[PDB]
Amino acid sequence: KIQFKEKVLWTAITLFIFLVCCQIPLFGIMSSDSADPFYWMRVILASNRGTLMELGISPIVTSGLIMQLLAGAKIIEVGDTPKDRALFNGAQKLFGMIITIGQSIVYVMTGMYGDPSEMGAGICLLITIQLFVAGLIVLLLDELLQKGYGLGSGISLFIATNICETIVWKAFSPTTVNTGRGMEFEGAIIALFHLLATRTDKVRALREAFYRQNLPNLMNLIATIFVFAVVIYFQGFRVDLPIKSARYRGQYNTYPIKLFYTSNIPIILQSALVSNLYVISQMLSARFSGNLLVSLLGTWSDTSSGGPARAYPVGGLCHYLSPPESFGSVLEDPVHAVVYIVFMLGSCAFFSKTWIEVSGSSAKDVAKQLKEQQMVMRGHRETSMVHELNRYIPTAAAFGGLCIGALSVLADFLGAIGSGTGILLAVTIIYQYFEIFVKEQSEVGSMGALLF
Amino acid sequence: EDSPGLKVGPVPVLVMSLLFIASVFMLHIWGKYTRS
Amino acid sequence: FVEPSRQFVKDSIRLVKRCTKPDRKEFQKIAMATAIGFAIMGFIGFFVKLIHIPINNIIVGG
Amino acid sequence: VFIVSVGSFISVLFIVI
């Protein structure tokens, strides 16, 4: 069922079970994970999920997109499917579930006979399963609630939550620092300082000498601030113009669109594919099939995908996507930093324009809505509705996401936190989510912190 | 859709937890438990 | 890339003049709400770990 | 509509893998 209040609440109940599951995947027994490391991929990967072992919660985030794939599609004939009995839409939804399951199986180990995967890197079958129990309640919620047409405000809240958890997890992580400070920022602080530090705040910023060994953590505090000031400013611009409103009775409440609203959601997706692509590529090039001679032939040397003799993620797609990495401290590579900014900028504007059509806000959709809740007929002309309302809606959708996508690449350079790439994506989401949480609810706000 | 009509169930969620509690603690230490 | 850049410049020139920032009060109000929210997200993860680890051997109690 | 969705789906597909 539709209801802004219901959709936010469902995401909240799920959210807790993510953390209860997490601890056993973390460190259990002697278990270790060999390679993976990076940050940008990790914040994306993190639909409430963190630690050394990859992709526990990952099929679950995906599932919502699968539902959109078919429920509001139609073209390639097989509508109403040659299936016995009948009953479509729910049938499409059932097909959607199968696609999610197929994705899951390949990562996890499977039995030797009928196996059809593996021989590379995988396993994590026990490790995945506890996350799967948390994410099963999400999947089951999606099945019932949707009934072949569904949407939901799932996406934003899970990813957003995780980074706050991660910073706390890092604090109790041992960095082979001396026995603990007892409340300075995790690590990098000498033994003499540590005994003092527990007692209360004094010392730290004003002192007589501290710190400086190999900081990791003064970078964390200043990271948040850079994002903090500009995000709030751009959640302030708006276009109004409504008068006489609600029909007669006449009484007016202003209609608000930020114009960074309905624009933000494509950008999160745009960041997400690219970061994942960078981690995976290594497997395709070196250890799958085919690309030995083919690599040499294709890669002229300018940069082409699955490039020969490339160490770290393969040259091509990855090569433009980043420079050393170096946490933004080496970027004077006139050829890497420049391409990174421009590629992301062009990709972001593409996904903003495709969001308009039938997956988000367009001027035709808004036309019908303002006919229902009646602006007073909006002051309007003799009929010529077709233009009127239209012109500032494609420009607004494009502009909103284009600004954020430009900013994100530069933001990595200025300073992400302990992670050094990870912060920026998560923080932006929390501000957007807060507006979904209370403003859409159209009455009161949050829930919890009461009892009963 | 699914052939069960009561599919999602409060009962399955409880069952998952019930299996889990034995697996966490009997098998391995977490509170000065025996390790199998 | 020429068409996205052209749209972006056109939108901005109207937008600067006919829009204004969070008019003193609003920027603080949103920021304050976020700060309370941030605490809920991560400190729940702090409290579970606090209890769970010192059961096996006391290192801070829980 | 489908075409747009499919493009998005391919992008998504790698993430889970």
* Three-state helix/strand/coil letters over chain A: CCCHHHHHHHHHHHHHHHHHHHCCCCCCCCCCCCCCCCCHHHHHHCCCCCCCCCCCCHHHHHHHHHHHHHHCCCCCCCCCCCCCCCCCCHHHHHHHHHHHHHHHHHHCCCCCCCCCCCCCCCCCHHHHHHHHHHHHHHHHHHHHHHCCCCCCCCCHHHHHHHHHHHHHHHHHCCCCCCCCCCCCCCCCCCHHHHHHHCCCCCCCCCCCCCCCCCCCCHHHHHHHHHHHHHHHHCCCCCECCCCCCCCCCCCCCCCCECCCCCCHHHHHHHHHHHHHHHHHHHHHHHHCCCCCHHHHHHCCCCCCCCCCCCCCCCCCHHHHHCCCCHHHCCCCCCCCHHHHHHHHHHHHHHHHHHHCCCCCCCHHHHHHHHHHCCCCCCCCCCCCCCCCCCCHHHHHHHHHHHHHHHHHHHHHHHHCCCCCCCHHHHHHHHHHHHHHHHCCCCCCCCCCCCCC
Residue A156 near residue A429, CB atoms below 8 Å: yes
Nearest chain A CA: its distance from C34 CA (Å): 7
User: How far is the alpha carbon of C61 from chain A, nearest alpha carbon, in Å?
Assistant: 14
Q: Which residues of C are less than 8 Å from A236 in CB distance?
A: 19-23, 26-27
**So where are chain A's domains?**
4-439
Distance CA(A227)–CA(A234), nearest Å, equals: 11
List residues of C whose CB lies inside 8 A of any B CB: 52, 55-56
Please answer yes or no on whether A164 and C27 come within 8 Å at the CB atom.
no
Q: Do chains D and C touch (3 or more CB pairs under 8 A)?
A: no
| Non-local CB neighbours of A143 within 8 Å, separated by 6+ positions | A93, A97, B1, B2, B7, B8
Total tally of structural domains belonging to chain C:
1
Which of B21, B25, B28, B30 is the best residue to mutate to test the C interface, defined by the most C CB atoms within 10 Å of its own CB?
B30
Asked if B24 is an interface residue toward chain A (Cβ–Cβ < 8 A), one would say yes
Technique employed here was cryo-EM
CB contact under 8 A, B20 and A94: no
Question: A173 CB near a chain C CB, below 8 Å?
Answer: no
User: How far apart are alpha carbons A400 and A258 in whole angstroms?
Assistant: 9
A394 and C41 in contact by Cβ < 8 A? no
Q: Do the chains contact at A75 and D14, CB–CB below 8 Å?
A: no
C54 to chain B, closest Cα gap in Å: 8
C21 near A218, Cβ under 8 Å? no
Q: Does A419 touch chain B (CB under 8 A)?
A: no
The C-alpha of C4 sits at a distance from chain A's nearest C-alpha, in angstroms, of 6
Task: Compare all CA atoms of chain C with the CA of A449 and give the residue at the minimum distance.
Answer: C40
Rounded Cα distance between A57 and A47, Å, is 6
Tell me yes or no: is domain A4-439 CATH 1.10.3370.10.
yes
Identify whether the C-beta of residue A169 lies closer than 8 Å to the C-beta of residue C45.
yes
Instruction: Give the domain extent around C53.
Output: 1-60
Compute the distance between CA of residue A237 and CA of residue A256 in angstroms, rounded to an integer.
Answer: 10
* Coil/strand/helix, residue C46: helix
- Among D2, D9, D17, beta carbon nearest to A65: D9
Resolution (angstroms) equals 7.8
CB contacts, 8 Å: C42 with chain A: 161, 163-168
Long-range pairs for A201-209 at CB < 8 Å and ≥24 separation?
Answer: none
Chain D partners (3+ C-beta pairs within 8 A): A
CA gap A321, A406 in Å, rounded: 14
Q: Tell me the nearest-neighbour CA distance from D11 into chain A, angstroms.
A: 6
**Chain A residues close to C38, C-beta within 8 Å:** 164, 430
Residue with tokens 């209040």: A5
| Distance (Å, whole) CA B16 – CA A153 | 26
